[PDB]
Design an enzyme around this catalytic site. Structure first.
Site, short mmCIF file in Angstrom:
data_model
loop_
_atom_site.label_atom_id
_atom_site.label_comp_id
_atom_site.label_asym_id
_atom_site.label_seq_id
_atom_site.Cartn_x
_atom_site.Cartn_y
_atom_site.Cartn_z
N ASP A 295 0.04 10.77 -6.55
CA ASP A 295 -0.74 11.38 -5.50
C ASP A 295 -1.75 12.38 -6.12
OD1 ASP A 295 0.47 14.09 -5.34
OD2 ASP A 295 2.02 13.31 -4.02
N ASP B 82 -5.13 15.16 8.69
CA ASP B 82 -4.39 15.82 7.60
C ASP B 82 -4.91 15.37 6.24
OD1 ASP B 82 -2.64 17.73 6.55
OD2 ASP B 82 -0.87 16.44 6.72
N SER C 138 10.23 13.46 0.85
CA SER C 138 10.68 13.82 2.18
C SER C 138 10.09 15.16 2.62
CB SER C 138 12.21 13.83 2.28
OG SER C 138 12.79 15.05 1.86
N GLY D 299 8.12 17.23 6.42
CA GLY D 299 7.68 17.21 7.81
C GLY D 299 7.46 15.81 8.36
N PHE D 300 7.01 14.89 7.49
CA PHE D 300 6.74 13.49 7.81
C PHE D 300 7.96 12.54 7.93
CE2 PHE D 300 7.55 12.34 3.40
CZ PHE D 300 7.10 13.41 2.65
N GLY D 301 9.11 12.93 7.36
CA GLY D 301 10.33 12.12 7.33
C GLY D 301 10.77 11.85 5.89
N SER D 302 11.35 10.65 5.62
CA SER D 302 11.82 10.27 4.26
C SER D 302 11.20 8.95 3.85
CB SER D 302 13.34 10.15 4.22
OG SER D 302 13.94 11.39 4.54
N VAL D 303 10.62 8.91 2.62
CA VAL D 303 9.94 7.73 2.09
C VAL D 303 10.66 7.26 0.84
CG1 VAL D 303 7.77 6.72 1.26
CG2 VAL D 303 7.71 8.49 3.04
N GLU E 37 2.43 -0.67 2.10
CA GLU E 37 2.13 -1.20 0.78
C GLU E 37 2.34 -0.08 -0.25
OE1 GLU E 37 -2.61 -0.69 1.28
OE2 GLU E 37 -2.01 -2.63 0.43
C1 LIG Z 1 4.08 11.28 3.27
C2 LIG Z 1 3.99 10.93 4.60
N1 LIG Z 1 3.86 9.66 5.01
C3 LIG Z 1 3.83 8.71 4.08
C4 LIG Z 1 3.93 8.96 2.72
C5 LIG Z 1 3.82 7.88 1.73
N2 LIG Z 1 3.35 6.67 2.00
C6 LIG Z 1 3.42 5.98 0.79
C7 LIG Z 1 3.03 4.68 0.46
C8 LIG Z 1 3.16 4.26 -0.86
C9 LIG Z 1 3.68 5.12 -1.84
C10 LIG Z 1 4.09 6.41 -1.52
C11 LIG Z 1 3.95 6.82 -0.20
N3 LIG Z 1 4.19 8.02 0.43
C12 LIG Z 1 4.06 10.28 2.32
#
Ligand SMILES: c1cncc(-c2nc3ccccc3[nH]2)c1
Length: 273
Positions: free
Chosen positions: A96, A135, A14, A16-20, A89
């Site tokens: 990362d 980015d 989570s 600036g981008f939101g929650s994943v 996906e």
């Molecule tokens: C920051 C901002 N927007 C998206 C993510 C993101 N997408 C993903 C897709 C698959 C796994 C992990 C992931 N994390 C991270």
């Protein structure tokens, strides 16, 4: 509905981008990532070929989401009263590039070459699709550890690609070019090449070259690790202070440091397995 279609797993991240969240599509057990973005936090809005009002991120993801595995694919999206939900996906196992470099330190040049080449092919795909990411950085690159394949993520700061000047920027400052720092103006392709120079230095040195605005403006590149002359030359070229002095994508890929790249599978076999 969405709630029944997906099994929510743990929070992956989570900010600036939101929650994943990690997730599984209930129909075929497919691994997915579920990204939630609050509506009040979305400044850039756009519209799909039909004309529905959606975040620009959804427009950009649809423009890039096809056969090529170098960009994370948007599988579906949903609108809630106060948020948008994106189904992406999810490679498994995954790490990362920021976490990868943090754990392993500066990358061997053979590995950085394979990784950098794949990022260049992914960025070229975005640009060919009319999308500017804005980015590019280690945190926004996923490594599919079994296949040795890299994927660009987070199109939340992106824009449609254009040939005129950009006067807005909400990406990462330490990856932003001197023309943005000094004049609050940049052109898409040459700003993308600057961020690619920052990323390559990060891969071969284990850290970014500049921290302060003054350093970005001066653009003097100091190498803290042992780096080949060809790699140093390419980095210093991407990091040219004048945008017109930077290489095009073709010039980067034809650079002597970029020759004899390993295939992604060979990369996983030698460096990741
Ligand atoms: C920051 C901002 N927007 C998206 C993510 C993101 N997408 C993903 C897709 C698959 C796994 C992990 C992931 N994390 C991270």
């Amino acid at each position: 509905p969405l709630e029944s279609q997906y099994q929510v797993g743990p929070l992956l991240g989570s900010g600036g981008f939101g929650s994943v969240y990690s997730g599984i599509r209930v129909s075929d057990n497919l691994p997915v990532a579920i990204k939630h973005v609050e509506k009040d936090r979305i400044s850039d809005w756009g519209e799909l070929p039909n004309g529905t009002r959606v975040p620009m991120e959804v427009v950009l993801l649809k423009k890039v989401s096809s056969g090529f595995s170098g960009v994370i694919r948007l599988l579906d999206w949903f609108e809630r009263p106060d948020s948008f939900v994106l189904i992406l996906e999810r490679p498994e196992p995954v790490q990362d590039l920021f976490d990868f470099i943090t754990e392993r330190g500066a990358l061997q040049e053979e590995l950085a070459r394979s990784f950098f080449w794949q990022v260049l092919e992914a960025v070229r795909h975005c640009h060919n699709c009319g999308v500017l990411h804005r980015d590019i950085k280690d945190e926004n690159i996923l490594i599919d550890l079994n296949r040795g394949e890299l994927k660009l993520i987070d199109f939340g700061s992106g824009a449609l690609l254009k040939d005129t000047v950009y006067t807005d920027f909400d990406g990462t400052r330490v990856y932003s070019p001197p023309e943005w720092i000094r004049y609050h103006r940049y052109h898409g392709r040459s700003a993308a090449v600057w961020s690619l120079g920052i990323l390559l230095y990060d891969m071969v040195c284990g850290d970014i070259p500049f921290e302060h605005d003054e350093e970005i403006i001066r653009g003097q590149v100091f190498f803290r690790q042992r780096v080949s002359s060809e790699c140093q030359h390419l980095i210093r070229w991407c990091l040219a202070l004048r945008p017109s002095d930077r290489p095009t994508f073709e010039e980067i890929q034809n650079h002597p440091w970029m020759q004899d790249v390993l295939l992604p599978q060979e990369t996983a076999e030698i460096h990741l397995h």
